[PDB]
């Protein structure tokens with residue numbers, strides 16, 4: 153075994169014990185490396201830059217989740233400290249080849265991975281980047297040169313900042329006639345495709361920095377989780393817009409046509425694996441103003457009722473069927489984000505930040521790994537896009553929807569509910585009749601494409 | 606077959622409401638929680654000698670999906686309306702949650718409990734008398750709990766089960 157310096161001259165030389173590092177029973181499934189359960193920051197930074205082997209998964213996890221237990225400025229200090237190794241002949245020649253070069257190389261891998269995949273720490277603190285460039289400048293060596301250059305090229309780059317898709321579908325509204333666009337005038341296939349494209353881009357824009365530390369639930373959520381929130385607000389807007397379309401169609405025949413068309417949009421969302429789209433529709437249908445419209449759902453064809461029940465069933469038993477179905481499909485898809493949010497929050501709130509062993513505090517790294525597993529799953533669905541053509545006018549129409557207008561939430565949701573009670577009064581009030589509002593035909597063009605690909 | 610009660614946790618985000626259910630399910634001497642599994646939200650319990658199963662829905666973290674509340678709430682037979690005793694706004698939000706529960710269930714008598722949760726050692730801004738008065742205006746029980754010590758957690762949930770049984 154190698155003779156390392158004293159802990160008084162080099163902190164990372166201190167040996168492993170029950171007081172500074174602990175492990176899980178299992179090993180990395182594909183790498184055979186032990187799984188760290190907890191440790192001190194010193195021991196975690198030692199194992200992040202371990203001399204015996206490279207640990208890419210641990211680097212991945214650490215760099216995603218360390219901010220809950222160590223500041224960016226403190227991590228940079230601890231990795232520069234790790235690189236500055238003092239000596240404790242044949243013993244020295246082995247030390248320099250089996251301890252110093254591997255460790256120094258692993259520190260540089262951390263630096264590289266940090267500037268590449270978590271550059272926001274540097275964007276948010278210019279002094280952190282000043283120090284990183286300073287450190288990288290002092291690095292000298294033949295083995296180092298190649299990695300020092302790569303890092304410098306990433307920093308400067310970061311500082312600078314398929315086949316034919318299907319034909320676009322049109323129904324009553326024609327290309328460019330943006331003034332006539334509505335739920336029944338636009339083609340139901342194209343509504344679903346264009347909403348799937350918006351919702352996919354909204355999904356792909358959410359980063360782990362908006363999720364780690366449950367920051368979207370905290371007072372600075374608007375600063376720290378802007379892409380997640382835009383995504384949730386689009387979803388909410390579309391649910392509300394669907395409800396608005398329904399209850400503002402006072403004529404029963406026209407309302408049946410409206411509900412039926414939304415169920416067709418749902419069917420296309422199912423085809424495209426847009427589960428966010430699916431649940432937007434299901435949420436609208438199970439809302440207080442829509443759910444009670446028994447005279448409307450009575451006239452809905454059985455095939456559309458069945459489509460709606462299967463979609464509703466995905467959410468039952470704590471998303472049991474949704475969870476199975478998402479696992480069974482391959483990208484492109486648009487997952488429902490809410491489950492991930494709940495799982496990250498509960499993982500973080502339901503587990504301790506620190507574990508105590510022989511009265512010594514150890515950072516609970518396994519809690520952080522569990523969170524990084526959820527962020528990795530989010531990311532696995534963000535890599536693959538859809539092979540659908542954007543229609544810029546239909547896109548702009550859904551981006552600019554604003555069913556609420558200037559009304560507050562309570563005001564608007566009470567207006568929707570009072571509209572529901574007006575169009576279909578509560579028993580034993582008889583059902584009134586209402587005039588038609590649509591001067592165009594109510595018949596759908598269906599969900600099968602009009603022409604061949 | 607033993608009776609199963611579908612319970613729903615409703616309340617403001619950002620105030621650690623998830624502690625109530627986490628502390629119920631996780632054994633009184635274990636802290637290693639995994640929300641990904643079925644045992645994380647189901648628990649067989651004995652209440653007044655009658656064995657039952659509590660299935661608890663807590664959507665903590667999905668507050669911004671405001672249009673999904675009705676859908677989530679309609680799954681419940683009983684509701685735990687939770688606020689944090691250090692956050693007055695979360696206490697003031699209760700009136701609308703209850704109104705929404707009543708609308709969703711289409712009933713003025715829905716089994717429900719008011720839960721005042723002490724999530725940390727930050728200063729109390731909601732006095733027990735205020736919440737005791739609010740709970741009496743609605744005709745429901747008030748239970749106060751601690752996220753640190755587990756004090757009041759069983760009582761909050763068991764009081765709800767009793768409200769469903771006596772409905």
Ligand SMILES: *[C@@H]1C(=O)N(CC)C(=O)[C@H]1c1cccc(C(N)=O)c1
Nearest residue numbers: 619620621689691692724725727752
């Ligand atoms: C407890 C509380 O009352 N407030 C308002 C001051 C909180 O922010 C809340 C809190 C929030 C998240 C988590 C936790 C926790 N550790 O239980 C507490």
